[PDB]
Symmetry: C3
Subunit: 204 residues, 3 copies
């Protein structure tokens, strides 16, 4: 009835899936386990991508500091824009020709900020302001369109949430079979699966 140990006449979610041998059970126990791993991974992997979209700040840091720059506080705003520009260049879409355009455009943005700071370190106020307004040519030229990376990520992350919700429900259904070999298979899968993909984000 209610937390049995068995391998006989156990239906599994779909009408075609039924198990009457122990060899069929290990198949079901390996699948339910892998679903439990895939799940806790899915959840982490989905967050990792969400935290990577950092860029949303970097991008708005550059554009908020330019609006702040447009009165010798400019050099500090530009220091904030320099750090933002570097972590932004590291970025890459989720797994090379467009990327080489995007990354090579960011090389300039650093140098242009160094020059407008080289004026501002000497004492030059209005000349760095005009040099800052030349950055708006460059960021528009290369980076502003490749915003595509951002949209692609949210859509990918919607699609992941969808699947994450189904897979959750599926693991509830298998747990509701009340079959301790399956229930354990899931629980142990959730236990280990989390550990492995936890170890992988710590590597990154």
């Amino acid at each position: 009835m209610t937390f049995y140990f068995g391998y006989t006449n156990v239906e599994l979610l779909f009408a075609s899936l039924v198990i009457n041998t122990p060899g069929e059970m290990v198949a079901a126990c390996f699948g339910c386990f892998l679903l439990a791993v895939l799940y806790e991974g899915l959840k982490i992997g989905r967050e990792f991508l969400l935290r990577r979209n950092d860029l949303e700040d970097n991008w708005e840091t550059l554009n908020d500091n330019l609006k702040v720059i447009e009165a010798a506080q400019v050099k500090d705003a530009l220091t904030k824009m320099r750090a933002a520009a570097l972590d932004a260049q590291k970025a890459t879409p989720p797994k090379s020709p467009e990327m080489k355009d995007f990354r090579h455009g960011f090389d300039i943005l650093v140098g242009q900020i160094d020059d407008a700071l080289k004026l501002a370190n000497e004492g030059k106020v209005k000349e760095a302001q005009a040099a800052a307004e030349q950055l708006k040519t460059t960021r528009n030229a290369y980076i502003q369109k490749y915003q595509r990376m951002l949209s692609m990520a949210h859509l990918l992350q919607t699609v992941l949430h969808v699947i994450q919700v189904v897979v959750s429900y599926f693991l509830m259904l298998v747990f509701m079979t009340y079959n301790a070999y399956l229930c354990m298979a899931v629980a142990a899968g959730a236990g280990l699966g989390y550990f492995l993909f936890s170890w992988k984000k710590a590597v990154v």
Copy 2:
């Protein structure tokens, strides 16, 4: 038995709710769908409020920097207090007479910090310290009580969690009916619902 497609003799959570026509099914499928949307919204909307309580930092930033100020490092602590004071003024309770008192009090706090920095930019140490101690009159006068905004938010967010837990369980029960029209209705609702309220926080 087990992932059927049907509209005949399907009970739905409560003894009174049973469906024997396809027209009753779409009613059940629209409700289960809307519950799936309302849910993924509830979750996001509940986090949005939690992240808005920022203020808990702004407030403790002001009060930690005053304790830091009470030796020409004061002007920097006051710069941190200026930024804190502005984002704090933007704030508003979850959906005007008390707000106009709260926001108009914050106008002073900015000006008072500008004056105690206008002393500290000229070189005046002990005079800015005494001007800083005049801020403790103002923040107590207007802002310190309206702390109410904070308590109202956590209580609202408790009440949301409560409902969020029930609604979760209800969606599990409907999924457990094993009726593919309902199961899909939920899953598709979770899929889309997330997308819409995801799009709404990106607007904010």
Copy 3:
């Protein structure tokens, strides 16, 4: 059938657990309630520990700033290293001889940073760089091994997730009994339990 109020012939997860008296029901209702409290606590308590591992930044802030220091920008990097060193010393493993070694080692790290800033405030460039390289003796001597605190925490947090997943599933099973006294017991437990452990992190 389907959201009944009853205390007669209600099995509860395990074959041995069955209830036929109202006195047995309150026992089941108190246990299901406490499981609902323990749960929402478990979730919060598990996050609290995760957010405490701050240290992972403090540690990498010190080691990234030393690499940055190895040209009178060093004094600022050292200011960042000073703040990092203090919040790092506060830290403690989850509930005294090793701790007294760890905390007393951090006293030096602050003083050593103050001295290498006392050189850098006077104008001395290369002397503070060599004084910074003396910090690498001290952090290795005491703090770098006690990294143990970090590993102990992730392993503890794996073990918590495991139990958190089981307890979730168990609360689903009791809710699936469709017995309104149990269902309420859980829901009310989740409602209150969250409030109490929410109140406890706000105390910390």
